[PDB]
User: Fold Endo-1,4-beta-xylanase 2 from Trichoderma reesei.
Amino acid sequence: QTIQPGTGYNNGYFYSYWNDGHGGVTYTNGPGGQFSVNWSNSGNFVGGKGWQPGTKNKVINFSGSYNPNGNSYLSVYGWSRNPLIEYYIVENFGTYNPSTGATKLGEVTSDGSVYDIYRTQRVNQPSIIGTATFYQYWSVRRNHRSSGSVNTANHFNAWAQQGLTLGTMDYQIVAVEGYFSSGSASITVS
Assistant:
């Protein structure tokens, strides 16, 4: 049901909901792997369902609707530790392609589309272990979609081939992220 920022388990799935406190966003956990998010002139937020810990060979399935009006992403999102890495497999997005200005490190074909691979760096930013400097890895889908199946191994292997190594897996979720925008989404993970 509607909750405030936090993490935990719901119907067998790990969930994480975070927001910068600006207001304008409603996150709701549904049955099974379902979650919904409605937002209006929000601040920055991330919310979704998945696993804790994730794995390097998981096949993630998602089904739903995603209607952003502004800056927002729909991705398989997660972290690794040692090295500390924040990663995204972006299936859809609004007005901003998050790879803008990033360094392209390759291409990978998976689950019906080519994805462009990028690496960026976050300097002294919040992370799962506190303020730190770490890299972000991206796989950005060329053919946008709001339902599908993601073979994570194809991405992690393509990244490693290019020198983008991952450490020990931390959480891994299907998330809706927004940055001062509006929209609605209803996604079911499995």
